[PDB]
Fold:
Amino acid sequence: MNISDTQVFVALVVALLPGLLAFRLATELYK
Amino acid sequence: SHTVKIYDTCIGCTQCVRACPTDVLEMVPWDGCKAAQIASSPRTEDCVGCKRCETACPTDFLSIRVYLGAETTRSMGLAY
Amino acid sequence: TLEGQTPIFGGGTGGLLTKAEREEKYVITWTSPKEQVFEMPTGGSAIMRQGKNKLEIARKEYGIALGGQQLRAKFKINDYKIYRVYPNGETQMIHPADGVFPEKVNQGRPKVRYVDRNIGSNPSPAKLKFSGVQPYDAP
Amino acid sequence: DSDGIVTHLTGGNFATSSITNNGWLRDFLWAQSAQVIQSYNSSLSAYGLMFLAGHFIFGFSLMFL
Amino acid sequence: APFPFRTIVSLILLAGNILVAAIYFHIIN
Amino acid sequence: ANSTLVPCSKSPAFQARMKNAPDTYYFNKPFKAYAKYELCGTDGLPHLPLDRLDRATDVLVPIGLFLYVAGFIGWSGRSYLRATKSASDPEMKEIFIDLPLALQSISKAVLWPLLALQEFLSGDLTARDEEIPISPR
Amino acid sequence: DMTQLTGSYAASWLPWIMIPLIFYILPFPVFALIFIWIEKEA
Amino acid sequence: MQHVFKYLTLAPVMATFTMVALSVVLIMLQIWFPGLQYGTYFKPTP
Amino acid sequence: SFAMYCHNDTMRAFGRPQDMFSDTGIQLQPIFAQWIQHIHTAAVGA
Amino acid sequence: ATKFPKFSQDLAQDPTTRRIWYAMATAHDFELHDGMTEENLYQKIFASHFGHLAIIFLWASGVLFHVAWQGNFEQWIKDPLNVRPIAHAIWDAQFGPPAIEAFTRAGATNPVDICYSGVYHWWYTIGMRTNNELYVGAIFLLLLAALFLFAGWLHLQPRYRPTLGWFKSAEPRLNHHLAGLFGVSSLAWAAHLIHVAIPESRGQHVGWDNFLFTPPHPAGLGAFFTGNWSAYAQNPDTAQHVFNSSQGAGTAILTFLGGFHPQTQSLWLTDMAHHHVAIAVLFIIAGHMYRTNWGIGHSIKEMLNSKSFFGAKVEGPFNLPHQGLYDTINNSLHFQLSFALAALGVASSLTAQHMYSMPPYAFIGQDFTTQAALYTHHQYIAGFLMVGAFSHAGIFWIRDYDPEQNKGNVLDRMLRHKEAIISHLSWVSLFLGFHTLGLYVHNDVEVAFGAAEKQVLIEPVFAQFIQAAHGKALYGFNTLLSNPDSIASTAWPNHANVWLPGWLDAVNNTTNSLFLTIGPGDFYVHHAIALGLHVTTLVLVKGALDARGSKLMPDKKDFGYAFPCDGPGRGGTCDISAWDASYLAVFWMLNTLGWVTFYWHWKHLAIWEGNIAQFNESSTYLMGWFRDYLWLHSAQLINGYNPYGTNSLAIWSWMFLWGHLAWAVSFMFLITWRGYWQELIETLVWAHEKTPLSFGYWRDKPVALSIVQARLVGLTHFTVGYIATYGAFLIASTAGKFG
Ligand code: F6C
Ligand code: F6C
Ligand code: CLA
Ligand code: CLA
Ligand code: CLA
Ligand code: CLA
Ligand code: CLA
Ligand SMILES: CC1=C(/C=C/C(C)=C/C=C/C(C)=C\C=C\C=C(C)\C=C\C=C(C)\C=C\C2=C(C)CCCC2(C)C)C(C)(C)CCC1
Ligand code: SF4
Structure:
C-alpha cells in the first residue's frame, strides 16, 4: 500500500520550503 | 589584450620585431647589450598571441614572453 | 581622407564584412614604380596601379602581411603605410608608427613593458595571492 | 539446390536489419564476426590473431592523436 | 656515508619481509 | 603444503590434452617434457608456482640467464657511449657504428657483473647530482 | 490495459502533466530567461 | 668500396643485421628445441 | 541520412515498427535507381 | 561589456561566444574572481558547502519519496529473493504498446524501472518496513535540506559571516569532526541499530510512538552502568533465525559472532551495532588529542616544527624535516582538498572491495545486478576522486606553494628529486606493460595455434598464501588461520577468538564472494591493474611535479594551471600544462577502472552462471576476454529490440548505442583541433551575412572552442560514453540472465 493522494500533495507543499530557501541562498551567493 | 614583456637578457637581434605579424614590437635604444638596443611592446592591443616572437628569440631562456589574457576582437584575429 | 587608386580587382569573397562598417577597418596605401600583379591577403590576385594605391582590408595583419612579405620583400616598395579607420570617419596612421620601421632602432622611442630582471627571477604566484598582481608584472 | 531455390548466406536480413545501426551492430558486426572470434585452434587462427592485432593498433594510435 | 638511520629502517622492513616469507615457505609456524 | 597443484603426469585432465594433441613435432616431445617436469592445475594446463624450495633452480636459471644477457646488452651500450664522448663527433658515432669500438665494448661486457661492481665501488658508475642537467624547481 | 501510459500510484495524473511541463513546455522559457541574463549589457 | 663499408656500418643497417641474426638464432632454437618452457630448460628429454 | 537511422532505432525500440523508415513502414523507394535497372534490362530485350 | 559573468571583467568584455563558455568553466574558481579576498573566499565556500549538503539531502529525499510513491517496497519485504525492486515509474509518451508491456513488470500495473542501487536492501536492514516510514523519512530530509539552505544564507549575513581566523583554527575543527562528526554520529547510528534495526529484524516494531518505553535489551541500561557488559552479548540470534521474524531470534544487542547470518548471507546486525559502538569510542577518544582552549592537547604546528627527540637532535619525525608544513596546509585550500579527495578515493575503493565480499545488507549478495552496479559505481567514483587528488595537488604547486616558507622541508625535498621519482615510475610502468602484455600475446599465440598447454601460467602464490593465512583451506596450505593448531587461530594466551568460528564458516563457504579462489588468470589481471595504477600515477605525479616548470618551460608557474600550450617554438609544446596531465590521466583512469570492473564482472558472471571453469581457462589470454566476456555476453543486450519485437532490455540496447555515439563524438573533439574549425566558422559567418531573409545576427561572435575547452569537451564525451556504454552492458548482461 503506497502513499495516498494527500501525502503526495503534502510533500509537494513541503518541498516549496527548500525550494524558496534554495532561491534565497542562490541569490545571496550571487552577491 | 595579451601581455608582452621583454627581459634584460635581450641581445637586440631584432628577430622578434621582424617576426611579429601585427606590428606589436619595435626596437628602442638601450645599453644593456652590445647591440645597444632592446625590444619593446608598445602596441600590445594589436597582439594576437601567435608567439612568433618567442620562436624567433635566440636567447635561453626567452628574452620576450607573451602571456595570453583577455580576448578582444583583434586579439582573436577576427575579420568579422 | 586617404588618397590613392584601388588595385584592379574583380571582386572576392574574402573582403570586408559587417565589422568594417561597425567597429573598425584598415587601409594600406603604397606607391609602386609600375603596374604589376600581387596577391590579395585573403585570396585571389589583384593588379596594383602605376601610381599610388589604396587597399581596404579587414584586419591589421593583412596589411603587415601584404606590405611586409609582398611589397617590401618581393616588389621592393618601402613606402607603404597602414591606417586604422573608424566608422565615425576618424583615421589614424598606425604603421610605421613614427615613420621608421619598427625593426630599425629609432631615437626617442621609450621602453614599454620592460622587466629589469631575467625571466627566471619572477616571483612565485603564492607570494602574490589576493593582490591581483601577476608574477611577470611584479616589481 | 536442385529446385532452383536460393538460400542466402545471411538469409535476406539486409532489408529489415540494416535500417537501424543496432541491426548493423548485432546482425552484421556481432553475428558475422563469429568466424573470426572462434577461429582459435584452427587454420583461421591467424585471422583471429590479426583481428586482435588491428584492435590493438587502433587503440595504440589514440595515444598519439 | 653508511647512512645509519636509513639502513636500520631498511633492515627492519626487510626483516619483516623475510619473516613473512619464512611462514610462507613453512620454515616456521 | 600446496595441494591444488599436482604433477602433470598424474593429472587426468592433462592426460586428456596429451592424448588429443596432434601428432606433430610441436606436441610429441614437449608434452612428455611437461608430464615429467611441470605441475598442472585442475584444468590440465601446466602452472608455474613460486612456493617451492625445491625446483628453485627452475626459477633461478631463467632469471639469472636473462639478467646476464640484459646486463650484457646494457653494459655494451653504456661502455660504447662513454667511449664515444671523447670523440670530436659523438653523434656521428651513433648513426655510424664504430666496429673496433663496438667489439671492444662487447668483449668487456662479457664480465659485466664484475665491472659494474668495480665501477660502483670506485664511484665511477654514477655521475654526481650537481653535475647533471635539471629543470628549475 | 497495456496500450497506454497509466499509473496505479496515487495522483497518476501528475506525470501526465509534469513530464510535458519540465521537458518541452517550460525549458524554452527557461532558456529565454538564461539567455536574457547572459546577454544583459553592463 | 670504402664508402660501401661505411654504409654497412649505418645504424639502420647494423640494427637490421643484428635483428636478423638474433631472429635466426631464436628461430633455430624453436626448430631444434620446440616447446621449451619455464621449469623445463636444460633438462634431458624423457 | 544518419539521423533517420537514429529515428529507426528509437521507433524500433519503442515497439513502433510502423513509424520506421522501411519497406513495411514509411517507404523511401530509390525510384531513380530502380528505373535505371529496368531501362538497362529492357535495353537488351530481357 | 555584459553583466555576465559578474566575477570577471576580462570575460565580460569578451565579444565572442567564448565568454559564455568560460563563465561556466570558471564560475566556481573563487580564487580567480575579481577583487576576491581570502576572507570572502572562505565565506563563499562555506555557504557553497551548505548548498551541496542540501542537494545531497534532497537527492536522498527523492529516492525515498519515489520508492514510497511508485515502488514495491512492502511487496519486496515478503520475498526479497524473488521480487524485483522498483526504482520509479516510467512516463515516456513516445512509448508504443510493445514498450509499455515490456516495462510493465515486477508486479506493477504501469511501466517501471528496476532499482539497482540497493536502497531496498539497505532500508530493509535498518528496520524500515512500510511505505509510510519511507514517506516520513523523505519529508524529514526535505526539512533537513531546508535547514541547511537557511544555514548557508544565515552564515552569509554580515553578523554571522565567520572571520578568517575561525576558518583557520585547525585544532578545534579536528577535535569536533573526529569526536563529534565521526564519533557521536557513529554512536547515534549504533543507537539506531540497537533500538530500532535489531528489534525490527526480530519481528518487533519499534518507532517514534513506542521507542521511549520499549527497552532494546531485557537487562536495560543497568547492565551498562554496573559493568555487566556481557549481558548484552548473551543469547544471540540462532543460526536458524528468520529475518524480520522472532523465529529463532535471540535477545543480544552487541555480539561479535563474525561471518554471515545464515539466511540473509549478510553481516550480523548485532555485529554491526557493536562495530559502530567501538568505532564511536575510538573516534571520540581521537577527538581529544589536540589543544583548543584548555592547555591540554597536542599542537600540530609544534609537532611539525619539533627538532628534538627526547633531547637528541633530529631533523624531525622519522629524522625528516617537517617544519613549516603547518602553514603550508593551513593556507592552501588545494592541499587540503587534495588530501580530502585522496581519502575519499581510498574510502570509495574500500567500500567497493569490502561490500561485495562482506555484504552488509540482507539478501543483497544474491541480487547479482545490484552487486555489480554497486561495485562498479564506487570503483569508478574512487578513480575520479583519485584523479582530483592529484589535480588539486598540481594546483597547489602553482598557486599556494612558495619555496621560501618551505625551504629544506620534506615537501621541498620531493620537488628536488622529481626526476628520480618520475623516471622510476616510468620504469615500473614499462616493466609491467612489456611483460603483462607480452605474456598475454604469448598465451594468445599458443592458444590460437592449438597449444594451450604451452601457455605461461604463473600461479598467484603470494595472494593464495594470504587467503590461506585468513582461513581458506582450499589451497591446502596449513599456515595461520587455516591451521587450527597455529598460535594465530588458537590465540594461545587468551583464546578470545570468538570471531573465528563465524569467520571461518564464511571464508570456506563456496557460495559467497569472501576470498574468491584465484588462479593464473587472476594473477595476470592484477598485474594489468598494477600497470594501470602506476601509469595513471605517473601521468598525475609528473604533471603535479612539473607544474612549476620543466626544461621545456622553466617559467610554467607564471602561466597558471590551465593554459593551451606555449606555441610551436622550441619544438612544440602541445599539452604542456599541468591541467593537460590531469586531462591525459582521466584516459588512463578510465582504462584502469575498465580493466578492474571487467575483471570483477567476468569473474562474478562465471560464478553466478555455474561456469567458473570458463573464466579460469579463458582469462589467461586476451582473446578469452574479447570472445567469452565481451562478444558472448553482448548477445542478449543487443537483442533488447530487433525486427521481431522489444523486451525490457530495449533501454539498455538504446543506451548501449547512445554511449557508443557519445564516445565517437569525443574523437572529433580530441583528434581535430581548433584552427580547422575556426576557418570553417569564418566561412559560415560569410554565408550568413550574405543570405537574405536571415534577420538574426549574433550578439556574441561565433568562434571555435578554445584549445583547452576542446580537450575538456572531448574528455567529457569520452567519459560519458565510457560510463554509459559499460553501464548499459553491465546491467543488461546481468539482469537479462538473472533476476
Ligand atoms: C538566430 C538566427 C539565425 C538565422 C536567421 O535569422 C540563421 C540563418 C541561417 C541561414 C542563412 C543558413 C541556412 C539555414 C540552414 O539550412 O541551416 C541552419 C538551420 C537552422 C534551423 C538554423 C536555425 C534558424 C533560426 C535560429 C531559427 C530560430 C527559431 C527557434 C525556434 C528559436 C527557439 C528559441 C527557444 C527559446 C529555444 C544558415 C546556416 C547555418 N547556421 Mg544559422 N541562423 C541563425 C542562427 C544560428 C545559430 C545560433 C547557430 C549555431 C548553432 C547557427 C549555425 C548554422 C550553421 C552551422 C549553418 C549552415 O551551414 C547554414 C549555412 O550557412 O548555409 C549556407 N545558426 N543559418
Ligand atoms: C615477455 C613476454 C614473453 C615471454 C616471457 O617469458 C616469452 C617466453 C617464451 C618461452 C617460455 C617459450 C620458449 C623459450 C625459449 O625459446 O627457450 C629457448 C631459449 C633460451 C633458453 C635462451 C635464449 C636466449 C636468447 C637467445 C638471447 C637473446 C634474446 C634476444 C636478445 C631477444 C631479442 C631479439 C629479438 C626478439 C629479435 C616461448 C615460446 C613462444 N613464444 Mg613467447 N614469450 C613472450 C612473448 C611472446 C610474444 C610477444 C609472442 C608473439 C610473437 C610469442 C610467441 C611465442 C611462440 C610462437 C612460441 C613458442 O613456440 C615457444 C614455446 O614453445 O613456448 C612454450 N612470445 N615464449
Ligand atoms: C644503450 C643501452 C641502454 C641502457 C644501459 C639503458 C639504461 C636504462 N634505461 Mg634506457 N633506453 C635505451 C638504451 C639504454 N637504456 C634506448 C635505446 C631507448 C630508446 C627506446 C631507451 C629508452 C628508455 C626509457 C623510455 C626508459 C629507459 C630507462 C632506463 C633505466 C632503467 C630501465 C632500463 O634498463 O631500460 C630498459 C630498456 C628500455 C626501456 C629500452 C631500451 C631497449 C633498447 C632496444 C636497447 C638498445 C641497446 C643498444 C642499441 C646497444 C648498442 C650497443 C653497441 C653500440 C655496442 C636505465 C638507466 C627507464 C628509466 O629512466 O628508469 C629509471 C625509462 O623509463 N630507457
Ligand atoms: C532530487 C530529487 C529528485 C529526483 C532526481 C526526482 C526525479 C524524478 N521525479 Mg521527483 N520528486 C522529488 C524528488 C526527486 N524526483 C520530491 C522530493 C518530490 C515531492 C515534492 C517529487 C515529486 C514528483 C512528482 C509529483 C513527479 C516526479 C517525477 C519525477 C521524474 C520526472 C521528473 C519530474 O517530473 O520532476 C518533477 C519534480 C517535482 C514535482 C519536484 C521535485 C522536487 C525536488 C526536491 C527538486 C530537486 C532539485 C535538485 C536537487 C536541484 C538540482 C541541481 C542541479 C545542479 C542538478 C524523475 C524520475 C514525475 C514522475 O514520477 O514521472 C513518472 C512526477 O510526476 N517527482
Ligand atoms: C527520442 C528519444 C527519446 C526521448 C526524447 C525520451 C525522453 C524521455 N524518456 Mg525515454 N526512451 C527512449 C527514447 C527517448 N526517450 C527509448 C528508445 C527507450 C527504450 C525503449 C526509452 C526508455 C525509457 C525509460 C525506461 C525511461 C525513459 C524516460 C524518459 C524521460 C526522462 C528523460 C530522459 O530520458 O533523460 C533526460 C535526462 C535529463 C534531463 C538529465 C537530468 C539532469 C541531471 C541533473 C543530469 C545529472 C547527470 C548525472 C549526475 C551524471 C550521471 C549519473 C549516472 C552515472 C547515474 C523522458 C520523457 C524515463 C521516465 O519515465 O522519466 C520520467 C524512464 O524511466 N525512457
Ligand atoms: C569536493 C571535490 C572538489 C572540489 C571542491 C573541487 C573544486 C575545484 N576544482 Mg576540482 N576536481 C575534483 C573535485 C573537486 N574539485 C575531481 C574529483 C577532479 C577530477 C576529475 C577534479 C579536477 C579538476 C581540474 C582538472 C580542475 C579543477 C578545478 C577546480 C576549481 C575550479 C572549479 C571550476 O573549474 O569551476 C566549475 C567547473 C565546472 C562546473 C566544470 C563543468 C562540469 C564538468 C565539465 C563536468 C561535465 C558535466 C557532466 C556532463 C555532468 C555532471 C553533472 C552536472 C550537474 C554538472 C575548484 C576550486 C580547476 C581549477 O582550479 O583551475 C585552475 C581545474 O582546472 N578540478
Ligand atoms: C592500446 C592503447 C595504448 C597502449 C598500448 C599504450 C601504451 C603505453 N602508454 Mg599510452 N595512451 C593511450 C593508449 C595506449 N597507450 C591513450 C589513448 C592515451 C590518452 C592520450 C594514452 C596516454 C598515455 C600517457 C599520458 C602515458 C602513456 C604511457 C604509455 C606507456 C606505458 C605502458 C608501458 O610502458 O608498457 C610497455 C609498452 C607497451 C605495452 C607498448 C607496446 C610495445 C610494443 C608492443 C612492442 C613491440 C615491438 C615490435 C618490434 C614493434 C613492431 C615493429 C613496428 C615498429 C613496425 C606505453 C608505451 C606512459 C609512458 O610513456 O610511460 C612510460 C605515459 O606517461 N600513455
Ligand atoms: C626472490 C625472488 C623474487 C623477488 C625479488 C625481489 C623482491 C627483488 C628486489 C630487488 C630490488 C629491491 C632491487 C633494487 C635495485 C636498486 C637499484 C638502485 C638498482 C640499480 C641498478 C643499476 C644502476 C644497474 C646498472 C646497469 C647494470 C649493472 C648493467 C646494465 C647497464 C646498467 C647501467 C643499467 C621474485 C618473486 C621476483 C622471483 C623469484 C626470486
Ligand atoms: S628576439 Fe629576443 S633577443 Fe632578439 S630582440 Fe627580440 S627579445 Fe631581444
